[PDB]
Structure formats: structure tokens, C-alpha cells
Amino acid sequence: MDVRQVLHMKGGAGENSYAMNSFIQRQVISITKPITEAAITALYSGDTVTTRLAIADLGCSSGPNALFAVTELIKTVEELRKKMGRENSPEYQIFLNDLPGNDFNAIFRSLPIENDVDGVCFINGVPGSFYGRLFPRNTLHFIHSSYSLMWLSQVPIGIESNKGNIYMANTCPQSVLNAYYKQFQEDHALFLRCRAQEVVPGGRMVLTILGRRSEDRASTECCLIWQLLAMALNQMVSEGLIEEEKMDKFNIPQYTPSPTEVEAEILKEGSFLIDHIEASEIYWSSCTKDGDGGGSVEEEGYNVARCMRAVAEPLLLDHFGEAIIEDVFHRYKLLIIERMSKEKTKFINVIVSLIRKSD
């Protein structure tokens, strides 16, 4: 019950939600530029990428970021082909992938409004799950992917997650719960097999999954944010609100963090090589040089909520209905604002650069 595929996407661009609330995932893509520079330099260096380069963003979204990274690759490549590696640029063939029901219209419109693109970039939207095959065999040289690979194929089955039902969140789950991990394995390995068939032997993949360091499936490194949402909900279930305890006891984000558990999966599948694989970290700055450069009634208050709202409003709205929503984010907002103080909130970013190997 609950088909992630048909159910989740991020709030649709234009308005205040996901486009107007994804600056943090934007900075992560920023900071991850170097790892990707090595990646495309390495791949461009010497032919495999001849007359056609085919970059593909997996789990892109709406608004900026969708094209942000696939636009700093075509950049770099062009800057090489001129400082020499070849005399002509290749034609860039882009593939923006996401689940059906993401805002492809929003991108095709308010975005490529940039008619064509430099070096000529043929853009293509590919709807579907990346936990399966999206492109023909040996079609791709380069696969980018930030903050999307932690999302799961489905919710993990066995679940007695009562209190902090929401997630793998720490304290009170009972290892029985961590069938999440058992889930991540079959999902992530099925992702790799597929990618292995479509990525050309020289091809590169730079995946950025939001995970952790603590090797302890339950830490504020990953479980807080949902815990905070859960906490917001459990108070409303108590206060009497349209969640019986029967309803909340069924909601559960379906995604999993982790760091070495990744390499653990990448080599099990003997398809990709590995490189610079690390785990960076970022603060819930969730802003920019924003007008008011506030404290918490801003920095997390609102900015970290509107983000977690554009990110989960649909999962919720679909499991509890609109009547709630307004209220759960007003509360959730406050909880993080306060939780912002007693501690320094942040996320971990297992990053991996890879190479289809074999031949």
C-alpha cells in the first residue's frame, strides 16, 4: 500500500515550493563540482566521447538544478575541446529523468525557454523509475545524480514503527525496523545492474546520496528532520487531530542514508570501479545571502521547513489529506527552529564517482 512511483514528487515549480525552496540541494551540487570535473575530464580525455556526448540527470526535478549540473558539464567539456582534446565539440544529448508526475511541463517551459543551448543541446525528459531500465544498452557516457538516490523503491515491509513511525529515526525503532537497510540493498543493487547495462564501458557516474557517517543507522546525522516531523505529528494525533494513531501508525518515509554501505553495494555488483568516494557534510543554512540574514525564526524557521515541505507535502497530503498540512508545517516549523538552537543541524553527503569497468 502506497506506490512511491505514482505518489511522490516535489512541489511543482513556479510558486513557493521546490524551485523556490531547493537552495541546499543546489549548494551540494556546487560543492560536488570538483569530483565531476575529474569525472568528465577523465571521460573526455581521449576518444570514447567522439561526436556525441550523452549526459543524463537521474532524479532531476523542476526549476533550476534539473539543468544546473548538466550545464556545468557541457560547460567544462567545451572548455577542454578548445584548450584542445579535439577541434569540434560534440553534440550534447541530455536526458532529464524523474518519476511520472514530476513537473516536466515546468522544465520544458519556464526552463528551456532558453530556446536551444550552447554546443546545441538536445533535451529529453525520460519519465520512469531509475530502479529499472530507462535507456537502451550502451547509450550513455555520463550519469549525474544528486539527492535522489536515497529514495526507495517502496516503503520497507515489516513495520511496527509506532511512535517515530515516520522513519528509521533513532530511539524506539527496534532493529526489526531496520529492514530499511534490507530494502536499500535490493533497491540500490537493482539500480546498479540497470545503470551497468546502459552506461558505456568508458562512461562515468557521479552519484550524491544524502546519507551519514555514524555507521549507526540511527543518529541525528540522518534521523532528525523526520523525527522532528513525527514529533510534530504525534502531538496532533494526541491533540485529537485527523490522525487516529491508526493513520500515523502507517505513514513512513521510504528512503535510507548510509556511507560505506554504498561501496559495500557497488563492489558486490561487479560493474563499477569507484573513485574519490567520500562523505561531505552541509548545514541547514538552507538559504543564501537572503534579505534579513535572520537567526532561526528564519535560517531554519521557514527556510528549512519550506524545503522539507516542498519535499514531503505530497507524501503527507496523500496519506492524511489537505485538512492537516497547513497545521503540520506550522508546528514542524517551530520544532526545527527550537531544535536549531540546542544543536548545529546538518546533513551528510555520501558522494561517489564511478566508472563502468569491464569490456
Ligand X SMILES: O=C(O)c1ccccc1O
Q: Under the rule (CB under 6 A), what is the footprint of ligand SAH?
A: 8-10, 22, 25-26, 29, 59-61, 65, 97-99, 102, 129-131, 146-148, 151
Alpha carbon distances (Å) from 17 to 10, 49, 116, 311: 8, 37, 27, 8
Query: In the range 124-163, which residues lie near a copy of itself by CB under 8 A?
Result: 124-128, 132-137, 139
What is the end-to-end Cα distance of the chain in Å, rounded?
A: 41
Residue 29 touches which of ligand X, a copy of itself, ligand SAH, none (Cβ within 5-8 Å per kind): ligand SAH
Q: Per-residue x/- mask for ligand X, residues 17 to 36, rule CB under 6 A?
A: --------x-----------
Residue 225 touches which of ligand X, a copy of itself, ligand SAH, none (Cβ within 5-8 Å per kind): ligand X
3-class SS at 180?
helix
Confirm whether residue 283 is marked as ligand binding: no
Q: Does 225 interact with ligand X (rule: CB under 6 A)?
A: yes
**Binding residues with a copy of itself: total (CB under 8 A):** 31
Cβ within 8 Å of residue 57, ≥6 positions away:
66, 67, 69, 70, 94, 95, 96, 97, 144, 145
Confirm whether residue 175 is marked as ligand binding: no
Residue 59 touches which of ligand SAH, a copy of itself, ligand X, none (Cβ within 5-8 Å per kind): ligand SAH
Distance CA 262, CA 282 (A): 19
Distance CA 214, CA 20 (A): 32
Confirm whether residue 25 is marked as ligand binding: yes
Q: Count Cβ neighbours within 10 Å for each residue of 148-159 and write b for 16 or more, e otherwise.
A: bbbbbbebbeeb
The helix, strand and coil proportions of the chain, stated in percent and rounded to the nearest 5, come to: 35, 15, 50
Report residue 1 as a C-alpha cell. Answer: 500500500
Task: Tell me which residues touch a copy of itself (CB under 8 A).
Answer: 6, 51-52, 91, 93, 95, 100-101, 103-105, 108-109, 112-113, 116, 120, 122-128, 132-137, 139
Task: Tell me which residues touch ligand X (CB under 6 A).
Answer: 25, 147, 225, 255, 311
